[PDB]
Structures are given as structure tokens and as C-alpha cells.
């Protein structure tokens, strides 16, 4: 069921606020034509109409589209929103000219000004909808060119960013395992905690991490301009970042707890994303309210971890990692993440 | 494995029942106890702490190896013997072999108490009662060979399946209607009905709001754990009649119906209590939630939609025959069927 997932977008205050504010405070909506790709409940389309859009094309391939038409009617907006119950890909296959001829009156003199969408998946790409958004963007820009309009469509969100940070797993182990298992009605069950923890780590980990796990605030790994980004880039996203732990407040926090002759080991890397539009940002960092997306953690091998093979003295040092986020097939909807020190 | 047993350890009601029952028993101190399906071994360790002469801890999963370490960790190794096998395999070994292997620990006492948490969903489903029955019979045979005739004390000593008619409307409201009613000024009610309508597809394992109850609940099945034999487990069935005229839970809804309105029945919810001495572990909707929740069996959608089973404000009488039947010969998996009277 599609209402399954959509509910938690509507349940998430950060996601709701980001889109509400971006739409209700943008300059290209009132009197303009908007496209909502993968509109599900149609919340974004309805916000756009309410905000005074000339017209909204709501694109939703699932059977939920029939019901969205009903909800649009229930909120008295059937005149401002047309639901296209089809995939972006099939609409494109029908062609520009056919689309123009059919929707000529709604398109108006200025064609499509804004493209709204929530396409993000885990670590921004995994199970995401980004390719459809890109294909939709190019399609509607050709629709616009057919009408003599070359103004680039404004994208919401307009930019996205993948962030990465090294982590220590000890704050996670402490808070999630060690403190529960230390005392069970006066019995020492710590052995159970260690077992539960080691094996949970072996079973990419999508979980909310305690902020204390961070050995560094995080660095930008990949940045996308949603107006210009093309599909070809999505095959393999890769970059190399270098953490200066000597300058990191997060690292020093741990450096303190290890004493003055202590060591700080790295257990892995956590990955999250932000998207933005204008002054607004929706973030999935461990320091932000959690979301369905949580954070994605990639651990170093158990031996590297257990033997503390990647560690630093209490005054810090430098750490470099090359990360690859790679499509596992041609849909560009499913990804893996690998890293190399 | 461990994930499950953590939930037991995380449930205050369950922990409290067993701890208080073990403390209340007059039959533990100086005597031998068997803990069937001991998991973390928490029950065995409580029994040891309560002064048992010795404890046989029976756990067939890989946890057994780890429970041996936790026992040693708490200096209980001379008190607890962990048998890393199934009840059935230990039984297959025979009375003589068991007597021989554990002669010194058995002494002249034999086994005086059998501890276990065997309960499944609505007491039978995915539970291990048959294994507990076999264990009890086997240890009473070991006892006879030892000259001991006293019946083994079972904790819990009794179990009861409870059933009540329900209305789903307070569920609809609290889980669906309240949420979808207003989404930032928008009426998304149509989605809530879709979501609720489909979700009602059979038996529903879910925590139901007590407000759903149309009667406080009636005993359907009662087991004496010392005496119950396997043969009764094939088809457990009975008929109960609910007096809705004298029911406070029904008046709750009678009041809100109006003098001309009616109160309709959407189905029946099933739960269980187990007890020992003055203590009771309950999984009723009015009790703190537990992993077993409650199990709800709904009437057909037509009977629910056309309110075919309904009562005037004065109430009336509702009869139901319920069958809880084994779906195979293991007696661990069950189906629930009902018929209105």
C-alpha cells in the first residue's frame, strides 16, 4: 500500500515544514504552472494551488492517484490540479507535442515554472526517485521550449548534499547495550550485551546514531544542483575527503574521555544528507530530528574494529576516505556504498 | 535469539510476575527446579537465589553456550546445570539415563518445581505448552523412580483465555480518523478510510484501546498446568454469552449512541492471563501492553459495514462459540474461528 509510507512524510514535522515553507515562500508559484512528480497524497500539489499556482500537474503512477483526485475534489481544488495517473517515463514516451496539444490551455503562455518533488531515498539515492525527477525536468523543459520558453524550471529542492563523518561505536554500544545488560535485577548479564552488539554489527546499517558517535562534524562528499544534474552522473558517485581530527571539537570530546595517554579508534563512517531551497534546509544529520531516513553507517571490518587498527593520539591527526555510492542495476534506484581508507 | 529475550527482560509485568512467584513459592528452597526454555536463564538464576538445591536449565538454542558463561559470571555454576538440548531429546534419552547422569544433583529430592514462560499468542499460537507438558510428565517419572510422588509445582500454575466483543470505531478514530482529518488545513479523511478499510484484512495481532471493549471479557478456556494433557490441545472450544445490559463497558457506548441509536459489534478480541499464588500476568487491553498484545477476530466486512450485529441502548445478550484449533500435528500453531449464537 502506498499510504503506508506517505503517512510518515505527513507525520514528520521537518519534512512537512521544509516543503510548506519552500512552497509558501517562493517567487515562482503564484500565477505560475507547477509540476509535482510522484505526488502520492498530493500534499505538495495542494499546497501549491493554495499558494496561488495558475495550475498544477500532479504526477502519480500508483493506484493512489484515483483517490487523490477525490481528495483534490474534497478540498475544492479540482479546477487547479490535474492528476496524471502514469509514470513520468510513460508520459515522456507519449511525447512533447502530444502533451502540449492536450494541456495547451493549462500550460498557458509561460509553460511550467516549478517542479516539486520529494525523491530522496536512503543516503539520498537508495530507493530514491531522483532519475524520474531528472527525466521529468528535461521533459517539461522541452515542453517549455516547444512553447518558445527557455527559462530553466525552478526545482524544489534546488540542491542536495551527501555528508560523511567518521564515528566511534562506543557511545552506541554503551547507550544501546551495555547499560541495559549490566544489571538485570542485580545479575551481571554484560556477556549478553557484547554478544547482541557484535552480531548486530555484522548483520550497511540504517539506524539513528547518537551524536556522541561522531568523531567529526562531517564533510560534504557529493553535491547536486537539481536544475543541472543529469542521469549519467548517477551510475557512480565517488569522492575522497580528508578529516582534520586535530581541529575537530567532536574528536576532542573523545580525546578528553580517553585521558592524556589514551587512544581514539575509528569504527566506521556515518552518511546522511541535506536538501535545501532558499533559506530552508531539510537535514538528516544525527544532530537533527530523526526521520524515516535515519543515517546510514558503514563499519570497518570487525578485526580493524576490535584490534583498534585505525586510531589516533589524543591530539588528533588526519583521516582520508574515498567513498563510492554505486548503482547496483540500470534503474538507478538501488545503490551500495563502499569505502577505502 | 537474544533480541526476543531482551523483550521479556524489558517487560516489567512479565519480570515482576515470575520474580514474585518464585519468591512466594514454598517449594523451591532446598529443592530441585527445572526451567524449560530458559533463554537468558533469568528464571533459573532467580530460583538459585531463592535457595534451590539445584536447577536444571533447559535451552536448546545457541544461547545455551552463552548462558553457561553468564551463570559462571554470577558465581552460580555449582547451582545451575544448563542442558543445551530440547525437552523431547532429553526425554528420548530415558528416565534411567537421566537419573544416572544427574544422580548427585537429584539426591532424594527429585524435581519439585517446573518454571517456564511457554505462552504464545492467545496462549497457544507459536507457544511451547506441549513441550512443557512433556517435561512435566517426564520429570514426574524421574521422580517416581527416585521414590518421589509429590506432583511438581508448575509456575504459572493456571492459565485462562479471555474473550470480549468489540467495536472498532474507537480504534478507527484514534489510529486513523484523528490523523487524516486535518493535514495543514486540508481534509485528507478519504485516505484514512482507505487505510483503515484495507488494514482490517486474517486474525489481527494488535494492541486494542480498552475503549473498544463492549464487555469486560469472559473466561473461555481455563487450564490447570499440573494436570492438563496434550490431548485437550487439539480443539479447544467453548460457548460464552455476554450480558450487554449489565455491562459498564457497553454503557460507555450506549451513552454516546443517543436514545434512538444502536451499538454495533465489529468482532471479538482474545487475550490471556496466567497466575501463581497471589500474582497474575495479564495481557488484557486494560493491562500494560506486552509482546503478545491481543488477538482480534473480525466479523465479515458486510456485517461490519451494514451494522448487522447491533444492540439498542438498553443492551441485550450476545452469544458466541469460539474454536481455537491446531493447524497441524505439532500443536504449536493455531487458527481461531467463531460463530455467533
Author numbering:
A (entry chain A): 25 to 227, 230 to 367
B (entry chain B): 26 to 226, 229 to 368
Could you pull the original sentences from the published paper?
Structures of apo-TbPRMT6 and in complex with SAH (SAH-TbPRMT6) were resolved and refined at 2.20 Å and 2.35 Å, respectively. The superimposition of the apo-TbPRMT6 structure with the SAH-TbPRMT6 structure revealed that the active site undergoes rearrangements upon SAH binding. Unlike the significant backbone motions observed in CARM1 and DOT1L active sites, cofactor binding primarily induced side-chain rearrangements in TbPRMT6 active site. Without SAH, the guanidine group of R39 of helix αZ and the imidazole ring of H318 of the THW loop point out from the active site. The comparison of the apo-TbPRMT6 and SAH-TbPRMT6 structures revealed the fine rearrangements of the TbPRMT6 active site upon SAH binding, which is critical for substrate binding, as demonstrated by an ITC assay.
The overall monomeric structure of TbPRMT6 consists of three parts: a SAM-binding domain (residues 36–181, blue), a dimerization arm (residues 193–225, yellow), and a β-barrel domain (residues 182–192 and residues 230–368, green).
